[PDB]
Design a protein around this ligand. Structure first.
Ligand SMILES: C[S@@+](CC[C@H](N)C(=O)[O-])C[C@H]1O[C@@H](n2cnc3c(N)ncnc32)[C@H](O)[C@@H]1O
Ligand SMILES: O=c1nc(N2CC[C@@H](F)C2)c2ccc(Cl)cc2n1-c1ccccc1
Ligand SMILES: O=c1nc(N2CC[C@@H](F)C2)c2ccc(Cl)cc2n1-c1ccccc1
Ligand SMILES: [Cl-]
Ligand SMILES: [Mg+2]
Lengths: 388, 371
């Protein structure tokens, strides 16, 4: 009878992550390197920096109003060097690539409608839109195990690449983790890892069997708790075989094309806005961080085992248009009661979020790989003590 | 008691991200017209005076990219420097790397995850929030093109907050709580005239009167000035409206963009198939609302995982729904392409007003289920 109980009582869920050298993630990191360069000189910089990456090319396009003097050639090339593209053998070289800049001022129509001649507390949302925050008690970091493990596998590849223990590794990687879960009254309980995919760019020397052995022994077994790995776990390691061609040569990349990788790995919800290259007046970023803070506060405060928060704005309007709560049936309180607790404890005006989460600080390049949520030393990851 | 709000947004055809989606799918369709087996990964970037095409194409087609891009921008309505953008005079840069070149067993072209969603709250099996948001942008384009509101320009955004009730997981729309409309405009029209027209000629022509009341909140031209717009106002990129393209924040999203990708990209083909599955389950009476996840590995034909969430709206378990899906659908990428007839140049039609909930797409025709 056990097989029948397993089929009925369990389900699969899949999340992916990508490494720093994935071309879409290159763009996110460069966009946030540009944002941080501005904020280091001008904490009030208005930044909307999109990056495009293709064979031999980084293009910056968008809108910046800032008192900073930023050397875009230096910032871009230093970011590409850090990622590890330093030779034509790797498909891309920070020393010799083309960097094109098409950056203008912020629209004066936007500036006058959002922030000009306002106290910072009264600044309007920098756009309309919807944003979600999510938290789950299934991990200590209050994140889905699927996305946590997917990100940590890419971080482990970069670590062993950079310390030279796996020197055949190159910067471009993708990971994907399928977890088999059971539920406890709307809370999800991870049982085992069902399937792992790892695809990583490599040099010309190493054989397919040697790479597959190292990815299991030095990466997967160093990241995934042994209790989640068993004789039935499926490993797709270099599944499409050779991956010498990678980075921007392999595929065009853009800023904001990994927004599900950046958030909850498909769990929770997403309002569609990209984070990278945007200052705190862009609610796509600041209100998603605040909603994460709310969701994590509700779970660590013991009000929910899992929770989703929606918030929405209109351009030029400080107060949110709507706030909504979905507790997945994991609270003794109604969604109406939880929403009252939120409105009693939190103030999701962008001019207040920036103070509560210290969002003028140049920490954004750190967020642009391995996820914006579930990591140490970000203000939105410190739960607020709730009163009600 | 038991009520809640949910918000979705949409953007118009001249929103700079949507310009990019439409151009990327115009390029895809141009290739498929000549070479039905064309491989296309066409990313478009739009900023002041510039359309850039970047990506990878394997095609026998000979495509005039200048003509395809300029005709797409003309149709959207950017035909003069007074509007911030002109198809006649803009820079078109082409960075596309083109190469000369059993179907059921072909491997996925990439790893990834994809979701499909359906809800019985509308006939089109889509959330009311995203349906109304899209229809408000379509009405703007309509009244711009027929000259009844000649001060309108192509760049628009809408946002609709609906107040809902629930019936055992099924969602029941009560009323429109809040509407935002921001639309690019000429320098002659006054703010009072635009706000009056947006309420009377746009909103009241689109939203059923039963959903509007004296408490409905209107944010019309809330920035107060929107003369600068299109790519001049804000850089556009392909695949930066993926939630507008799908369910308006309802259901779920795997992160893959649709526009500029041929039918061999599972980011597109498996999302369309997952929609087809979810819609078939709802129209088949098995659920009131349902979410389907599928995932792939590069070089593997069979999905790595398939998952169902019925929101508590089925008398059947998620396990029984999953068995019905597996008995009725083959979500191998080569089989999806055959079953949904995806080699046809139909993609530019998808690139504004959403990929789902609309007439005459094969993924919107429910499959009759045998179980
Ligand atoms: C507000 S802009 C995003 C922020 C912008 N990149 C910046 O530099 O602050 C995003 C979208 O809003 C719309 N938009 C542009 N200018 C606007 C204005 N003056 N008022 C309202 N909406 C506007 C356009 O559809 C544009 O693509
Ligand atoms: O939150 C979630 N919980 C699932 N659970 C299964 C029953 C209980 F165990 C919970 C679930 C399972 C399958 C899928 Cl395809 C989505 C799910 N989602 C979900 C829902 C909306 C959006 C994103 C993910
Ligand atoms: O499907 C959904 N249903 C809601 N309902 C409220 C109780 C019942 F009426 C249903 C709901 C409400 C608020 C929010 Cl913030 C999300 C919700 N979601 C949802 C969940 C996951 C992802 C995307 C949206
Ligand atoms: Cl936007
Ligand atoms: Mg933009």
């Amino acid at each position: 009878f056990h097989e029948a109980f397993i089929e009925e009582g369990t389900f699969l869920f899949t999340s992916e992550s990508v490494g720093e050298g994935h071309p879409d993630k290159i763009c996110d990191q460069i966009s946030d390197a540009v944002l941080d360069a501005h904020l280091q000189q001008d904490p009030d910089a208005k930044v909307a920096c999109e990056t495009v990456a293709k064979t031999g090319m980084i293009l910056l396009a968008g809108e910046i109003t800032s008192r900073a003097a930023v050397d875009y050639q230096k910032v871009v090339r230093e970011a590409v060097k850090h990622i590890g593209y330093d030779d034509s053998s790797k498909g891309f070289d920070y020393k010799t690539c083309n960097v094109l800049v098409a950056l203008e001022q912020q629209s004066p129509d936007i500036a006058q409608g959002v922030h000009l001649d306002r106290n910072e507390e009264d600044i309007g949302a920098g756009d309309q839109g919807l944003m979600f925050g999510y938290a789950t008690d299934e991990t200590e970091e209050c994140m889905p195990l699927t996305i946590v493990l997917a990100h940590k596998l890419n971080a482990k590849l970069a670590e062993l690449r950079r310390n030279g223990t796996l020197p055949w590794l190159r910067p471009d990687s993708k990971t994907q983790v399928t977890v088999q879960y059971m539920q406890d009254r709307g809370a999800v309980l991870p049982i085992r890892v069902h399937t792992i995919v790892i695809s990583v760019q490599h040099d010309e020397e190493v054989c397919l069997d040697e790479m597959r052995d190292a990815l299991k022994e030095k990466v997967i077994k160093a990241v995934v708790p042994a209790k989640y790995l068993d004789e039935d776990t499926i490993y797709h390691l270099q599944p499409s075989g050779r991956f010498v061609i990678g980075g921007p040569q392999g595929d065009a990349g853009l800023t904001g094309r990994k927004i599900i990788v950046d958030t909850y790995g498909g769990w929770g919800a997403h309002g569609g806005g990209a984070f990278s290259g945007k200052d705190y007046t862009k609610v796509d970023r600041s209100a998603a961080y605040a909603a994460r803070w709310v969701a994590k506060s509700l779970v660590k405060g013991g009000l929910c085992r899992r929770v989703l928060v929606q918030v929405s704005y209109a351009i030029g309007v400080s107060h949110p248009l709507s706030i909504s709560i979905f507790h997945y049936g994991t609270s003794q309180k109604s969604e109406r009661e939880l929403l009252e607790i939120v409105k009693k404890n939190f103030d999701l005006r962008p001019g207040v979020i920036v103070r509560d989460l210290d969002l003028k600080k140049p920490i954004y390049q750190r967020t642009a790989a391995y996820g914006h949520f579930g990591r140490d030393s970000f203000p939105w990851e410190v739960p607020k003590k709730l009163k009600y």
